Every structure is written in structure tokens, then in C-alpha cells.
Design an enzyme around this catalytic site. Sequence first.
Site, PDB file in Angstrom:
ATOM      1  N   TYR A 103       0.879  -1.159   0.000  1.00  0.00           N
ATOM      2  CA  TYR A 103       0.000   0.000   0.000  1.00  0.00           C
ATOM      3  C   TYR A 103       0.924   1.217   0.000  1.00  0.00           C
ATOM      4  CZ  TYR A 103      -5.089   0.234   0.106  1.00  0.00           C
ATOM      5  OH  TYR A 103      -6.404   0.299  -0.290  1.00  0.00           O
ATOM      6  N   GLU A 115       0.101   4.802  -0.944  1.00  0.00           N
ATOM      7  CA  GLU A 115      -0.666   6.003  -1.242  1.00  0.00           C
ATOM      8  C   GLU A 115       0.190   7.252  -1.279  1.00  0.00           C
ATOM      9  OE1 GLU A 115      -3.674   5.058   1.951  1.00  0.00           O
ATOM     10  OE2 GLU A 115      -4.999   5.969   0.470  1.00  0.00           O
ATOM     11  N   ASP A 145      -5.574  12.630 -26.557  1.00  0.00           N
ATOM     12  CA  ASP A 145      -5.659  11.239 -26.059  1.00  0.00           C
ATOM     13  C   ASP A 145      -5.114  10.413 -27.165  1.00  0.00           C
ATOM     14  OD1 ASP A 145      -6.355   8.578 -25.268  1.00  0.00           O
ATOM     15  OD2 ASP A 145      -8.334   9.207 -24.597  1.00  0.00           O
ATOM     16  N   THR A 168      -3.228   5.078 -22.866  1.00  0.00           N
ATOM     17  CA  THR A 168      -3.256   3.754 -22.296  1.00  0.00           C
ATOM     18  C   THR A 168      -1.951   3.102 -22.605  1.00  0.00           C
ATOM     19  OG1 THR A 168      -4.347   2.875 -24.307  1.00  0.00           O
ATOM     20  CG2 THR A 168      -5.726   3.494 -22.449  1.00  0.00           C
ATOM     21  N   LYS A 171      -2.696  -0.986 -25.619  1.00  0.00           N
ATOM     22  CA  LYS A 171      -3.000  -1.134 -27.031  1.00  0.00           C
ATOM     23  C   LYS A 171      -1.703  -1.277 -27.846  1.00  0.00           C
ATOM     24  CE  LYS A 171      -7.257   1.544 -26.494  1.00  0.00           C
ATOM     25  NZ  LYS A 171      -7.078   1.555 -25.040  1.00  0.00           N
ATOM     26  N   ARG A 203      -2.630  -3.306 -18.763  1.00  0.00           N
ATOM     27  CA  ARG A 203      -3.773  -2.416 -18.682  1.00  0.00           C
ATOM     28  C   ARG A 203      -3.531  -1.318 -17.638  1.00  0.00           C
ATOM     29  NH1 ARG A 203      -7.203  -5.257 -22.017  1.00  0.00           N
ATOM     30  NH2 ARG A 203      -8.914  -3.742 -21.961  1.00  0.00           N
TER      31      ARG A 203
HETATM   32  C1  LIG Z   1      -3.903   7.740   3.486  1.00  0.00           C
HETATM   33  C2  LIG Z   1      -5.316   7.399   3.879  1.00  0.00           C
HETATM   34  N1  LIG Z   1      -6.293   7.050   3.016  1.00  0.00           N
HETATM   35  N2  LIG Z   1      -7.545   6.790   3.609  1.00  0.00           N
HETATM   36  C3  LIG Z   1      -7.318   6.989   4.919  1.00  0.00           C
HETATM   37  C4  LIG Z   1      -5.949   7.389   5.227  1.00  0.00           C
HETATM   38  C5  LIG Z   1      -5.459   7.665   6.609  1.00  0.00           C
HETATM   39  C6  LIG Z   1      -4.651   8.973   6.619  1.00  0.00           C
HETATM   40  C7  LIG Z   1      -3.606   9.108   7.541  1.00  0.00           C
HETATM   41  C8  LIG Z   1      -2.858  10.259   7.606  1.00  0.00           C
HETATM   42  F1  LIG Z   1      -1.881  10.316   8.505  1.00  0.00           F
HETATM   43  C9  LIG Z   1      -3.105  11.327   6.768  1.00  0.00           C
HETATM   44  C10 LIG Z   1      -4.134  11.274   5.824  1.00  0.00           C
HETATM   45  N3  LIG Z   1      -4.324  12.421   4.997  1.00  0.00           N
HETATM   46  C11 LIG Z   1      -4.117  13.734   5.685  1.00  0.00           C
HETATM   47  C12 LIG Z   1      -4.873  14.832   4.949  1.00  0.00           C
HETATM   48  C13 LIG Z   1      -4.636  14.697   3.465  1.00  0.00           C
HETATM   49  C14 LIG Z   1      -5.112  15.951   2.718  1.00  0.00           C
HETATM   50  C15 LIG Z   1      -4.315  16.180   1.445  1.00  0.00           C
HETATM   51  O1  LIG Z   1      -4.099  15.213   0.669  1.00  0.00           O
HETATM   52  O2  LIG Z   1      -3.903  17.341   1.210  1.00  0.00           O
HETATM   53  C16 LIG Z   1      -5.299  13.432   2.969  1.00  0.00           C
HETATM   54  C17 LIG Z   1      -4.577  12.212   3.554  1.00  0.00           C
HETATM   55  C18 LIG Z   1      -4.906  10.088   5.768  1.00  0.00           C
HETATM   56  C19 LIG Z   1      -4.679   6.394   7.094  1.00  0.00           C
HETATM   57  C20 LIG Z   1      -5.482   5.071   7.097  1.00  0.00           C
HETATM   58  C21 LIG Z   1      -3.319   6.146   6.413  1.00  0.00           C
HETATM   59  C22 LIG Z   1      -6.639   7.807   7.572  1.00  0.00           C
HETATM   60  C23 LIG Z   1      -6.383   8.261   8.730  1.00  0.00           C
HETATM   61  N4  LIG Z   1      -6.154   8.675   9.794  1.00  0.00           N
HETATM   62  C24 LIG Z   1      -7.901   7.415   7.240  1.00  0.00           C
HETATM   63  N5  LIG Z   1      -8.935   7.501   8.077  1.00  0.00           N
HETATM   64  O3  LIG Z   1      -8.222   6.870   5.933  1.00  0.00           O
HETATM   65  C1  LIG Z   2     -13.061   1.811   4.038  1.00  0.00           C
HETATM   66  C2  LIG Z   2     -12.231   1.935   2.785  1.00  0.00           C
HETATM   67  N1  LIG Z   2     -12.824   2.112   1.584  1.00  0.00           N
HETATM   68  C3  LIG Z   2     -12.156   2.234   0.421  1.00  0.00           C
HETATM   69  C4  LIG Z   2     -10.763   2.165   0.351  1.00  0.00           C
HETATM   70  C5  LIG Z   2     -10.078   2.340  -0.991  1.00  0.00           C
HETATM   71  O1  LIG Z   2      -9.324   1.233  -1.494  1.00  0.00           O
HETATM   72  P1  LIG Z   2      -8.402   1.570  -2.802  1.00  0.00           P
HETATM   73  O2  LIG Z   2      -7.117   1.978  -2.128  1.00  0.00           O
HETATM   74  O3  LIG Z   2      -8.449   0.241  -3.502  1.00  0.00           O
HETATM   75  O4  LIG Z   2      -8.987   2.714  -3.590  1.00  0.00           O
HETATM   76  C6  LIG Z   2      -9.998   1.993   1.602  1.00  0.00           C
HETATM   77  C7  LIG Z   2      -8.485   1.941   1.574  1.00  0.00           C
HETATM   78  N2  LIG Z   2      -7.849   1.967   2.866  1.00  0.00           N
HETATM   79  C8  LIG Z   2      -6.736   2.848   3.172  1.00  0.00           C
HETATM   80  C9  LIG Z   2      -5.871   2.153   4.208  1.00  0.00           C
HETATM   81  O5  LIG Z   2      -6.377   1.524   5.133  1.00  0.00           O
HETATM   82  O6  LIG Z   2      -4.651   2.186   4.116  1.00  0.00           O
HETATM   83  C10 LIG Z   2     -10.758   1.878   2.859  1.00  0.00           C
HETATM   84  O7  LIG Z   2     -10.110   1.713   4.040  1.00  0.00           O
HETATM   85  C1  LIG Z   3      -9.051   7.187 -27.260  1.00  0.00           C
HETATM   86  C2  LIG Z   3      -9.315   6.326 -26.045  1.00  0.00           C
HETATM   87  N1  LIG Z   3      -9.138   6.804 -24.794  1.00  0.00           N
HETATM   88  C3  LIG Z   3      -9.381   6.091 -23.670  1.00  0.00           C
HETATM   89  C4  LIG Z   3      -9.815   4.750 -23.697  1.00  0.00           C
HETATM   90  C5  LIG Z   3     -10.094   4.006 -22.394  1.00  0.00           C
HETATM   91  O1  LIG Z   3      -9.294   2.862 -22.074  1.00  0.00           O
HETATM   92  P1  LIG Z   3      -9.741   1.937 -20.797  1.00  0.00           P
HETATM   93  O2  LIG Z   3     -10.648   0.918 -21.468  1.00  0.00           O
HETATM   94  O3  LIG Z   3      -8.378   1.407 -20.449  1.00  0.00           O
HETATM   95  O4  LIG Z   3     -10.534   2.723 -19.795  1.00  0.00           O
HETATM   96  C6  LIG Z   3     -10.042   4.120 -25.010  1.00  0.00           C
HETATM   97  C7  LIG Z   3     -10.536   2.685 -25.080  1.00  0.00           C
HETATM   98  N2  LIG Z   3     -10.646   2.134 -26.410  1.00  0.00           N
HETATM   99  C8  LIG Z   3     -11.661   1.135 -26.739  1.00  0.00           C
HETATM  100  C9  LIG Z   3     -11.273   0.476 -28.051  1.00  0.00           C
HETATM  101  O5  LIG Z   3     -10.562   1.115 -28.847  1.00  0.00           O
HETATM  102  O6  LIG Z   3     -11.629  -0.675 -28.316  1.00  0.00           O
HETATM  103  C10 LIG Z   3      -9.789   4.931 -26.210  1.00  0.00           C
HETATM  104  O7  LIG Z   3      -9.982   4.409 -27.444  1.00  0.00           O
END
Ligand SMILES: Cc1[nH]nc2c1[C@](c1cc(F)cc(N3CCC(CC(=O)O)CC3)c1)(C(C)C)C(C#N)=C(N)O2
Ligand SMILES: Cc1ncc(COP(=O)(O)O)c(CNCC(=O)O)c1O
Ligand SMILES: Cc1ncc(COP(=O)(O)O)c(CNCC(=O)O)c1O
Lengths: 442, 442
Positions: B54, B56, B208, B234, B237, B243
Site C-alpha cells: 500500500y 498512497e 488522447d 493507455t 493497445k 492495462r
Molecule cells: C492515506 C489514507 N487514506 N484513507 C485513509 C488514510 C489515513 C490517513 C492518515 C494520515 F496520517 C493522513 C491522511 N491524509 C491527511 C490529509 C490529506 C489531505 C491532502 O491530501 O492534502 C489526505 C490524507 C490520511 C490512514 C489510514 C493512512 C486515515 C487516517 N487517519 C484514514 N482515516 O483513511
Molecule cells: C473503508 C475503505 N474504503 C475504500 C478504500 C479504498 O481502497 P483503494 O485503495 O483500492 O482505492 C480503503 C483503503 N484503505 C486505506 C488504508 O487503510 O490504508 C478503505 O479503508
Molecule cells: C481514445 C481512447 N481513450 C481512452 C480509452 C479508455 O481505455 P480503458 O478501457 O483502459 O478505460 C479508449 C478505449 N478504447 C476502446 C477500443 O478502442 O476498443 C480509447 O480508445
Amino acid sequence: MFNNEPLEQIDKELHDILADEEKRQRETINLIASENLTNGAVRECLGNRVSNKYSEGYPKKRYYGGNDFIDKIEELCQKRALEAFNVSDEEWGVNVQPLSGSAANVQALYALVGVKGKIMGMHLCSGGHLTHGFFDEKKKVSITSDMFESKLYKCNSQGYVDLDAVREMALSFKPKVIICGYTSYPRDIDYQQFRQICDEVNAYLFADISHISSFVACNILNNPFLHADVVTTTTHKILRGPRSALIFFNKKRNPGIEQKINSAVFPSFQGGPHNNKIAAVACQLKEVHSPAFKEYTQQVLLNSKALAKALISKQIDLVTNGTDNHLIVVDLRKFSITGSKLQETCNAINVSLNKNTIPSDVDCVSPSGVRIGTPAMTTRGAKEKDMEFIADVLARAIKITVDLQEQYGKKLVDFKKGLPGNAQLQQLKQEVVTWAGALPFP
Amino acid sequence: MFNNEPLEQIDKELHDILADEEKRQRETINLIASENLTNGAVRECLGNRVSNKYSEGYPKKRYYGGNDFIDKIEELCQKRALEAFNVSDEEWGVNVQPLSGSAANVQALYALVGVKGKIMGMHLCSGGHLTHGFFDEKKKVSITSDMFESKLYKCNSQGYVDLDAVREMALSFKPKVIICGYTSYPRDIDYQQFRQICDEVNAYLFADISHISSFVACNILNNPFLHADVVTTTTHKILRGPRSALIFFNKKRNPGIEQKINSAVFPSFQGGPHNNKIAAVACQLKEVHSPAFKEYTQQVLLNSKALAKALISKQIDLVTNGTDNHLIVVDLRKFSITGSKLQETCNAINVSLNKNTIPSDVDCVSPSGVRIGTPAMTTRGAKEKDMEFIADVLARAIKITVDLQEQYGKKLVDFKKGLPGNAQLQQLKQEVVTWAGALPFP
Ligand SMILES: Cc1[nH]nc2c1[C@](c1cc(F)cc(N3CCC(CC(=O)O)CC3)c1)(C(C)C)C(C#N)=C(N)O2
Ligand SMILES: Cc1ncc(COP(=O)(O)O)c(CNCC(=O)O)c1O
Ligand SMILES: Cc1ncc(COP(=O)(O)O)c(CNCC(=O)O)c1O
Ligand SMILES: Cc1[nH]nc2c1[C@](c1cc(F)cc(N3CCC(CC(=O)O)CC3)c1)(C(C)C)C(C#N)=C(N)O2
Ligand SMILES: [Cl-]
């Protein structure tokens, strides 16, 4: 007209970093509440030629042919998802196409409310996710705070969801969605009381169960499927799958939701699905339904209970004084050390954990806790008796962090100068590597 | 505490669908313009344990530690990308986190204009993508037409971009973004005349180049980096990567764009990046910047010219009467068959192609053409002399489709009933399988 030389030969530069990255995983005590380790079978799927196929749309309603074997994989995944989470395919629907958790959430929310729509979620600082409507005085940090109109609810001074406040806010704000399920919340959720509040205002109940998915599946924690209109979850945390997400929708409670959610995923937000993901997700959802995986999940909770208890035994405070799930938030105010400081210290000893806010913190600048969790280490075979060691390591890191701060000053730039070469850290880092290195590793 | 049995033992059910799917790929003449086949090294990356991490945020600005080796890989990918597209890291920036083309586009558009912002792109029917602002009378089909205010520009009756119409629209509509670069456009783009139109009204120029990326890298077609504020693409292609997607931004024309794009990808839209993707993208980006890959891309164009030429030699009409790139769009109106019917017929003979609108088509209902392309087959080792056979096969398929329509009627329901068991199709299908089956397969 292609090069099929192996990765090591084709790109020795990239391959060393990856073999190094792998070593670091193997020699780290990984307490990231959101992380895990995939098995070989899931990784075989992600490396499968199925990702070559463009298969926009849904099975039996595709834009192109050539999708017979893609259709079987996608139907298998949705089926296995409904089964794993104990829902009737007559009453529940599942979309298996979202690329990741944040996408899954923005999509499902758009479906339910559309642009300008009113949403309510837990504040980031209190344990909510960015995609639950997070904004800030200065800026709308999430798209969910901008393409939606969001209001945000806090936890109380003890770190608990304050349902009286949720109702107070819902009655004055009058939204179409109330989000529950969180990123760093150490207790179970009262979905029943959420469902009653949503009915009272006529809003949808959205449960994001990404961190607790395995517990819901295995009936160890409360079931949001009894009360929610939509359930979203990531497949890569406790569930132990690939990086992907699932959106669940209640057909019975909401006829006409199925089309809204499918059309939100495609063609509103995504293009082609990633079939290697879908395949990998199918592989893991079969393992999720075995009683063997329920054994694993129970252990996540056992390890997490022991860890909380061993940490309290060393006079370390936990937010809400314990946990009902896989994760613990440690309040560090008594030691006068911030979360970043102890994170740096833990990184220096190959302990992976993240800084995290606690109830007292006004802003998200200078969080006063760290968050830890057990899924990863439980996957690595650690048991209840192993948590004393982890708790001992975290105690020693807290102490060391306190020593270094008194010596080098409060500023982080100053603090970190103290880190390199420290004989106790090298000693401790050494102790960590010997223990972590030994554990089984998929 | 995990199961580490191989995919074939752990899940024999899923593995058989995947081995079958592998057979269908190996035995198909794949003319999907947007498809390719990845080498083993790129698939090794996608199956790598780097997906467990992870990470971020961005490199050297992560929310956690433990990201030393992930930071290297992400920096290597951005560097390798700026090089491949022949841009100075002093003048251009790249974000390597978008999970797909669609996401990448919506992110970049948000960065530049924000919610409610005015955009302009090519109509879907005229060859634009869904994420270029596609809507229709009934509904705002793409989010790019809903969270933004979009207006769509056509191509003319001969199938060419109609710049007078773009100017005519740009001056009255006054957008902040004009999108160019397309999904089914067989000719090169006049990026300079687009830059001229945008300056005149003070909009950003967005290119694009997903379909034509390899040509731009290799300096075989026009270079939009000379004129564009933003370039998206992308990686799956013609470029032949995984992807994923890439957003490029021109710092010099627009200082302070870097923070806008980076904050739009995270934390506005995405959460954790997918590091297996990033790794994969890096692995292919090394290949893209090689003389060997330039040889491949030229060959894509050589094949596409010969194919256009062999089809015209058989009295088949192409939109704009030819191609400058990897793709052809066949106008089927002289045979009185729709594209969906020829897609069905080609599906029955293991020929992968998609239906596609033509300038004459008012709606996207009943498109009168099909789109073909050479990247996939060029990857499989086919040369210019092999395009006559593909042209032979497509002409034989068009003939068969007109016969069947005569026998069974114009309704698609009825048309398909004539397809199972057809002696000529079994025959043709069998000739495809023998030719395609033999060709090298990555
Ligand atoms: C990175 C992440 N993604 N979802 C989250 C977080 C956390 C986090 C932890 C931290 F230490 C900081 C921030 N941020 C501080 C403010 C930021 C504002 C900006 O980007 O300018 C956004 C990210 C966020 C954490 C699990 C890692 C977290 C907390 N607690 C929660 N509840 O959920
Ligand atoms: C409740 C919840 N929902 C959605 C997401 C988003 O998952 P993607 O990163 O796949 O977008 C997280 C990620 N959790 C942040 C952490 O615990 O580090 C989450 O904790
Ligand atoms: C110009 C252009 N931009 C963006 C995308 C989006 O790609 P994702 O599917 O990865 O979201 C496509 C997809 N092209 C569909 C095709 O040519 O068959 C595209 O043709
Ligand atoms: C599938 C795909 N994705 N991006 C696309 C397409 C195309 C297509 C081809 C077709 F035959 C149909 C549609 N659609 C018909 C209208 C649909 C609206 C709705 O959901 O109701 C959206 C998809 C779309 C094509 C490349 C495959 C295409 C065209 N031409 C362009 N230009 O770009
Ligand atoms: Cl992936």
C-alpha cells in the site's frame, strides 16, 4: 515479432528492485491494517493472458464477440461473491468490475445520488475514508466532496460513532446517502440503528466493509446485508485477494438499482474490465467460502484481541480501550510523541505500521496515534503467543522514540537525524529480521 | 496460514476456463484495433508480490515508510516514460498511477476544468471515446458529459475531422478543454490547427493518443507534445504494455499543472496505486524505447497499408479511403449488411473484429461498419504478404453474411439461426484456426 526473454534477462534493473522489495516483505513485521499477502494462485491469475481481451459491457450483453470464456469467468466471480457473503442471487446483485476501492465507492455513490447529490460519511480524522466525502476548510480533497455535496460526522471523545449526532446531522442535512463502514475504526458497527436513521429521512444506507469483509462473510461480526441497500468492498485487505473491488446492491429493497449501478461502473466511469483481476478475484472467493478460511479469519480476531491485551498490559492506551476486529489504534499522547515519529522508528526496525488520528486531534496534521492490524501477520502464521513479542517490539520502539526525541528535539527533521546508526535500533531491527524472516511466506 | 497449491490444483474449475481462453486467443485472427498480446516479462510483473504494498501518495511523499523499493520502481517508470515519448523531464511531467484509460482521462479533465467545467471532444459515432464527453438525447452516458458540460464535434461526410466546425463550436461554446486523439479514426491529426483553435479561445489542448501511442513515441506520426497542454494514453493497445494509463502535462506552458494532475489522480479520485501495474508499465517502457520496437511499429503501419490496399482491390470501401495508422474502418453499405451481422459471422470463423459507426450513421444503433487493426497480428508475426489472406478471409465473410441474410432475413434474431452448422463457415473457421494456430504466440 516480440521479445520473450525472461524478466531477469529482459530487464535486470527492474528485477533487482523486485527481488529486493520481496526480501523486505519477507523480513518485515507487517502491521498495516489494510495489507495482506496473496497466494501463488491469485498471482498466477494476475499474470494470465486473459488481460489481453477487451470485454466492455456485461456478460451476454457485450459490445464484442470472442467473450465466451470471459463471460464464464465474470459469472463465476459474481456467483462466488454472492455465495461468500451469504446473500440470495434472487435478492442481491454484485458488480465485479471496479478497478479498486475508491472507484467502487465513487461509482456506487454516483449511481445512488448523481452529481450535486447529498451524502453523509464519517470524517477522515475520526476513521472514515477519503471517498466518504472528505473535504477540508482549504479544499475539497476528495471527488466525493465536490461532485457530491457532503456533510461529515465525527466519533465522540472516546472514539465511538455518536448515533445521536448522526441523527441530528441527518435531520438538518436531509441527504440521499449515509455512509458507514470505515478505514480505522476498531469496533463493530450498529447497522440496525443506521437503517432506522436512513428510513427516518428516506436516505440510502451504504456500508463500505473493505477492512472487515472477511468477518462479515464468516459471520464473526454483524451483517450489513440485513440492513444496507448497497455494500462495497475491496478484495485485497483481510479478504486476501487481488487489488479490486465489489459493489453489492439490494434488488428487493430497491427495484431499478441493478441497472443504475451497472451503468455507473460502465459506461459512466470505466471502459474495459481487467479480466486478470476478475479471474484472480474468483480464485480467492472460492477460498473465502471454505471453512479453512473461517479458521484464518477467527485467528485474525484472536491475534488482534491478544495484541490489544498485551499492549494494555504494558501501559499502552488503545482508542476505545480495545477492539472488536482486526485493528488497533494506539493513543500516544502519554509519551508526548507524534505518530510520524514512531512510524519512522518502526520503519527503521522493519516494522510496518501507519500514523493515524485519534479523537482528540483537531486537524489531520500531527496525528497522535498509529494504526496496527493482524491480517498480514496472521497470514504469515503468527499465533496468539506471538503477539507478546510484537507488543514488546512496539513498546521498545515507543521507548526508543522517546529517548531520541529528548536528545534531538521535537522537529521531525531533527528527530530523524537521531535514527541512522542507532545501536539499539540496529539491535532491534536485527531481532525483527530473525523472527520475521523465519515465518512462512506465500 | 495459507494455501499455496498451484492454480490447477487449488481451482481446477477456473483454470480450465483460462486454458480454453488461451486456446481461443491462439487460434483467432485478432483484428481488434485496441488489443495486443503482452510478453512473458510484462506478465511476470503483473504476477509479482509488489501488489501487496500500500503506497498512497507519490514517491518521497508517501503516507507510510516501507516504500523505498516502490519509490524506485515508480521513479523508474516516470523517467522511462518521458524518455519514450521524447520529452525533457524539465519541460514535461508524467503521472503513472491511473488504473485505466478512462480513469486517467476523467482525472485529467477534472484537474484542468473541475466540476461543471466546459469540455469539447469528438462524438462517439464519429470516432471519439466515451470519456471525450459522450452523451445522447436520452441520457448523459459518460460521467465526462455529466460532471462536465460537454459539446461534441462531428467528422464530415467523408470521415475527416472538420476544423471549421471545431472553430465554429469553440468560438460560441468557449470551452476550457478541447479533446483530440480518438478511438476509431484512421488518419493522423492536425495538432497545430487544434493549438491554433485553443489559443484563439483560451482553452487547454488535450490529446488522447491511446490508439496511436507507439507511432508518436517512434516519430512515425505527428507529435502532439509540440502543441498539447496535456497528453493521455493507455499502455495496453499498440504500446503493448499492461492495462494501465499515463497522464502527461506540460509544465512550461502551464506552471502549477503538476500539482493539479497529481492531486486529481490522488487523493481526489484514486487511493492506493497498483504497483504490479507500475512495474509492468516500466518493463514495457524499456522495450518501447528500443530500435527493435520501432521496427515493430513500422511493421504495424506497413501491414495496415497493405490491408487497406488488399481490401480496396476486392472492391471493399474504407472510411476516408485508406489509413495513416494501424486501423481501418470498413463501410459495409454497398452489401446492405450491418456491422453487428459481420461481427457475428467473423466470430463464427474465429475472426475478432468490432462493429463501428461510419459518418453516414445518425445514431450508434445499427452501425454500418466494422473496425479492424493490425497491432495484435503484427505482434503475432504477420507480414505484408499475410494481409491478402486476411483480406481474402474478410471478403469471404462478407459474402457469407450477405447469403445468410438473403436466406434467413434482416432481423438479427433470425440472422444468427443460419450460423451454427454452416458448412462454409466450418470450412472458413477451420482455415483460420490452421493459419492463426501456427503463428508465434507470446
Ligand atoms: C492515506 C489514507 N487514506 N484513507 C485513509 C488514510 C489515513 C490517513 C492518515 C494520515 F496520517 C493522513 C491522511 N491524509 C491527511 C490529509 C490529506 C489531505 C491532502 O491530501 O492534502 C489526505 C490524507 C490520511 C490512514 C489510514 C493512512 C486515515 C487516517 N487517519 C484514514 N482515516 O483513511
Ligand atoms: C473503508 C475503505 N474504503 C475504500 C478504500 C479504498 O481502497 P483503494 O485503495 O483500492 O482505492 C480503503 C483503503 N484503505 C486505506 C488504508 O487503510 O490504508 C478503505 O479503508
Ligand atoms: C481514445 C481512447 N481513450 C481512452 C480509452 C479508455 O481505455 P480503458 O478501457 O483502459 O478505460 C479508449 C478505449 N478504447 C476502446 C477500443 O478502442 O476498443 C480509447 O480508445
Ligand atoms: C465499445 C466502445 N467503447 N468506446 C468506443 C466504442 C465503440 C462503440 C461501438 C458500438 F457499436 C457501440 C458503442 N456504444 C453504443 C452506445 C452506447 C451508449 C449506451 O450505453 O447506451 C455506448 C457504447 C460504442 C467501438 C470502438 C467498439 C466506438 C464506436 N463506434 C467508439 N467510438 O468508442
Ligand atoms: Cl492488475
